[PDB]
Amino acid sequence: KYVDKIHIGNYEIDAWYFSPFPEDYGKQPKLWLCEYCLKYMKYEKSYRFHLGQCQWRQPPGKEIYRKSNISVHEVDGKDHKIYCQNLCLLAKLFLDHKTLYFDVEPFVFYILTEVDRQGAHIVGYFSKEKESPDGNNVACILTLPPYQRRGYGKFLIAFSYELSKLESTVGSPEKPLSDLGKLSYRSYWSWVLLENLRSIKDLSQMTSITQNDIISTLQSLNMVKYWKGQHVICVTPKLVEEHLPPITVDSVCLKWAP
Numbered sequence: 001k002y003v004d005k006i007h008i009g010n011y012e013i014d015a016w017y018f019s020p021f022p023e024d025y026g027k028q029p030k031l032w033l034c035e036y037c038l039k040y041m042k043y044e045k046s047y048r049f050h051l052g053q054c055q056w057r058q059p060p061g062k063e064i065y066r067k068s069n070i071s072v073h074e075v076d077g078k079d080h081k082i083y084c085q086n087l088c089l090l091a092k093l094f095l096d097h098k099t100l101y102f103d104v105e106p107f108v109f110y111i112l113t114e115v116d117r118q119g120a121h122i123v124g125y126f127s128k129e130k131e132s133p134d135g136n137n138v139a140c141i142l143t144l145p146p147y148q149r150r151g152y153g154k155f156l157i158a159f160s161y162e163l164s165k166l167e168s169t170v171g172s173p174e175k176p177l178s179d180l181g182k183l184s185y186r187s188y189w190s191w192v193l194l195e196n197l198r199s200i201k202d203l204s205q206m207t208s209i210t211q212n213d214i215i216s217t218l219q220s221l222n223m224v225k226y227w228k229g230q231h232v233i234c235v236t237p238k239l240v241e242e243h244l245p246p247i248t249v250d251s252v253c254l255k256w257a258p
């Protein structure tokens, strides 16, 4: 009745949430998505026809990052409306809430793919409001379930902060963070603040992380104290811990200006 499973590429993925695909698309569905253009179809037959016809082998937009077989395509929703609407319907399957799927023009989408001989296979993405009333540098972030727990989510988070640094600005993800968002951000923020430390204003300037996110991270690392209510960094090179990363953003492979 609702879409509960999709076939994309040669993965099938069960839904985590309702996504408002048109009702008849509630086939089973089984919804069958082209992995390159993200067109949604109702039947294996229209799926197989499309696959032999569709000429796309990668996302639209500009490839603003490439290192080994990892790339990021920047995709303005005003210029690739249908693709971006298709993407937002896909993402809503794994996001407990999203803005209206058809209203993509206020956003730019950064699409992460793994590249092989066949083409560039979508791993995940984040979106960003062109203008955020709350200073959000990410609106939604997603690694598709089959690629999760491999470092792709932290890669995207890092990449969003690379864009913030280049724009000489601090940013934070849009609230509320899902429980998995919470774990990923806390993890990335701790690694970055720890690798840096080995001022809170200065940590902010250096990383584009907000002072509020720096403070809450430092508290959870026990590296902050109170002096007449004011938050003071309190640490030793002693630890600055690092016991129990996999893919990082190389600024040299990034081709983007503010």
Ligand SMILES: CC(=O)SCCNC(=O)CCNC(=O)[C@H](O)C(C)(C)COP(=O)(O)OP(=O)(O)OC[C@H]1O[C@@H](n2cnc3c(N)ncnc32)[C@H](O)[C@@H]1OP(=O)(O)O
Pocket: 094, 095, 138, 139, 140, 141, 142, 143, 144, 147, 148, 149, 150, 151, 152, 153, 154, 155, 173, 174, 175, 176, 177, 178, 179, 180, 181, 183, 184, 187, 188
């Ligand atoms: C602003 C917002 O968009 S909030 C919404 C965020 N997105 C979602 O909720 C969509 C569904 N979830 C996801 O797409 C992802 O889980 C993200 C994008 C939230 C995480 O993506 P991943 O590719 O799994 O991230 P990655 O492998 O980089 O791991 C990040 C951290 O989260 C932890 N984590 C990820 N999944 C789990 C899990 N199932 N159980 C426990 N910890 C987990 C990882 O172990 C890692 O912590 P570590 O650094 O201590 O190892």
Ligand SMILES: [Cl-]
Pocket: 012, 013, 014, 145
């Ligand atoms: Cl699944």
Ligand SMILES: [Zn+2]
Pocket: 034, 035, 036, 037, 038, 039, 050, 054, 055, 056
């Ligand atoms: Zn296609």
